[PDB]
Amino acid sequence: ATVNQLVRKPRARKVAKSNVPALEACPQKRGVCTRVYTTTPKKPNSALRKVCRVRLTNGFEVTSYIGGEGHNLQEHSVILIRGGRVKDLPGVRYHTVRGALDCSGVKDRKQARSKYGVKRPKA
Amino acid sequence: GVIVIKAQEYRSQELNREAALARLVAMIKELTTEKKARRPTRPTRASKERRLASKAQKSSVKAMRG
RNA sequence: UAGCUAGUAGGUGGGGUAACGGCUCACCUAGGCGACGAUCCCUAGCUGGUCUGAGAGGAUGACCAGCCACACUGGAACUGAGACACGGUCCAGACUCCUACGGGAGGCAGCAGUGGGGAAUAUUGCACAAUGGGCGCAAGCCUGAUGCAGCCAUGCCGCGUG
RNA sequence: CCCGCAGAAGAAGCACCGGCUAACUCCGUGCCAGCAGCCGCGGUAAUACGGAGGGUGCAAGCGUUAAUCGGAAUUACUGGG
RNA sequence: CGGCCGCAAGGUUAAAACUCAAAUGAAUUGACGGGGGCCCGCACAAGCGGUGGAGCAUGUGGUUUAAUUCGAUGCAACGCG
RNA sequence: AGGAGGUAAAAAUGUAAAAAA
Numbered sequence: 001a002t003v004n005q006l007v008r009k010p011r012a013r014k015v016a017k018s019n020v021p022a023l024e025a026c027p028q029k030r031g032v033c034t035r036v037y038t039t040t041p042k043k044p045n046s047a048l049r050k051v052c053r054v055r056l057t058n059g060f061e062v063t064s065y066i067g068g069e070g071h072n073l074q075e076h077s078v079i080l081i082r083g084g085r086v087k088d089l090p091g092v093r094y095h096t097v098r099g100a101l102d103c104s105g106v107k108d109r110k111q112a113r114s115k116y117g118v119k120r121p122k123a
Numbered sequence: 124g125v126i127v128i129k130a131q132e133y134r135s136q137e138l139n140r141e142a143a144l145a146r147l148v149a150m151i152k153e154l155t156t157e158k159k160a161r162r163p164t165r166p167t168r169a170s171k172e173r174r175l176a177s178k179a180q181k182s183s184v185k186a187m188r189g
Numbered sequence: 190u191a192g193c194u195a196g197u198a199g200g201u202g203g204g205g206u207a208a209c210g211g212c213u214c215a216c217c218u219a220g221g222c223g224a225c226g227a228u229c230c231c232u233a234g235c236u237g238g239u240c241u242g243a244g245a246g247g248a249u250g251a252c253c254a255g256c257c258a259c260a261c262u263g264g265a266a267c268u269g270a271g272a273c274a275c276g277g278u279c280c281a282g283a284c285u286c287c288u289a290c291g292g293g294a295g296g297c298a299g300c301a302g303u304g305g306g307g308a309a310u311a312u313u314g315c316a317c318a319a320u321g322g323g324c325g326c327a328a329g330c331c332u333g334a335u336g337c338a339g340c341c342a343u344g345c346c347g348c349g350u351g
Numbered sequence: 352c353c354c355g356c357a358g359a360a361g362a363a364g365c366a367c368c369g370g371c372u373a374a375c376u377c378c379g380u381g382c383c384a385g386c387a388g389c390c391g392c393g394g395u396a397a398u399a400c401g402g403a404g405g406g407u408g409c410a411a412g413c414g415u416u417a418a419u420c421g422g423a424a425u426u427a428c429u430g431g432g
Numbered sequence: 433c434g435g436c437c438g439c440a441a442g443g444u445u446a447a448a449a450c451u452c453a454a455a456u457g458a459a460u461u462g463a464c465g466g467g468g469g470c471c472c473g474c475a476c477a478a479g480c481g482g483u484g485g486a487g488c489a490u491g492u493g494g495u496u497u498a499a500u501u502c503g504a505u506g507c508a509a510c511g512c513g
Numbered sequence: 514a515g516g517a518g519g520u521a522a523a524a525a526u527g528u529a530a531a532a533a534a
Contacts, residue, residue: 027417028308082416
């Protein structure tokens with residue numbers, strides 16, 4: 001509407017926001033994975049998810065989500081981080097790829113073996 | 124750790140002795156017994172209150188495709 | 190980000206370059222730029238195009254081609270048709286190597302490769318047969334341009350596992 | 352490129368099966384442990400969790416994350432209030 | 433936050449980080465109102481006689497025990513099964 | 514039938530004793 005208002009002030013395109021603020025266009029990043037803990041989600045559900053803070057290689061203390069059940073981390077043992085949210089933890093933006101550089105894929109896991117670092121029993 | 128306490132205001136030296144004796148007892152006891160730990164606590168009304176939402180919500184979320 | 194600029198705006202004359210020009214001095218005029226967005230700050234090589242989209246637009250500029258710019262950092266020239274120069278020279282600095290301590294040497298953002306950073310990205314391969322260039326009367330000589338292979342499912346396309 | 356031998360030998364996975372969206376049952380755990388792109392699932396019968404078997408999709412690829420556009424006529428000049 | 437205006441109180445201009453999957457409008461049906469109107473019931477008013485006071489009977493809670501069987505536990509459990 | 518004044522009062526929350534770690 002009002003072309004003259006448009007020729008003075010152009011149609012400003014709203015800035016599209018990203019949801020993985022690690023770094024622009026960085027798929028995965030390595031993380032030291034310091035101080036691991038376990039707390040509880042919000043109102044609708046209730047559990048004790050294994051979650052940790054992650055000191056990144058660019059000095060970013062991001063908060064991630066330790067997946068699965070059988071972990072192998074504590075204060076050290078550098079791993080890998082992938083994006084994604086779980087909505088239950090009020091304030092998480094990062095996931096963790098099990099079967100990482102310093103975290104093994106959990107055993108006694110037969111189905112859903114693409115992720116969670118599950119090796120297919122060749123025998 | 125070579126503690127040095129100065130007992131000054133009192134013309135009598137022996138009055139300053141007990142003034143230093145008072146400064147001895149309070150200094151060490153305040154550093155002796157610390158805080159009481161072992162917090163936190165487990166939720167109480169979650170067993171009910173949280174489930175209260177689940178009893179009224181599920182009756183509404185049954186869409187039945189449109 | 191509201192004013193910006195003082196060889197700065199123009200004039201005259203001399204100097205100057207292959208070439209007109211404050212490109213440079215002497216003197217005169219007091220101007221010129223500015224909301225149609227100047228100075229100032231952040232970001233960025235640009236384009237034919239690429240991806241998507243009904244179209245218009247939106248994002249982008251790896252690969253191929255055109256153009257600009259850079260060569261450890263800054264500056265400055267010289268030879269010459271042309272650079273003010275990747276693999277030439279002079280100076281200063283930073284960082285390494287050689288040393289008889291006097292004094293010198295060097296530049297992979299060329300092809301491979303090493304460390305390193307990183308989520309990640311390949312052999313210290315073979316040969317100038319073809320094509321292109323350079324030089325030469327020609328024959329020829331050199332070329333990690335180029336031509337192929339090694340490695341990778343990275344994508345596309347295709348057959349197979351009857 | 353062509354020719355001969357050729358024992359089927361030497362060659363099939365991964366995701367998903369609550370709705371969104373093609374695809375189902377049982378056992379184990381009992382809001383604990385976990386799954387999840389969106390709403391959400393689970394209080395001892397869970398088609399949504401873990402596993403088993405059956406099903407579907409795509410295929411030497413398969414899913415996740417990331418980035419762009421589309422859907423977004425939710426920056427609308429075409430094309431909004 | 434910075435600029436500007438302001439004696440000051442402040443005003444004007446005008447973000448982002450982070451965060452939820454909503455917030456919101458109008459109308460509809462109920463429900464509710466220490467909102468209004470109409471109407472009914474021992475609701476009250478008008479009285480009669482009790483409970484709660486004492487004893488006893490009987491049921492429950494609690495407590496206790498080797499057990500004090502289970503269940504019922506506002507009105508609508510408690511001389512109940 | 515219009516009308517005109519007129520006549521009205523205090524009282525909260527829903528783990529609500531049931532926990533500690």
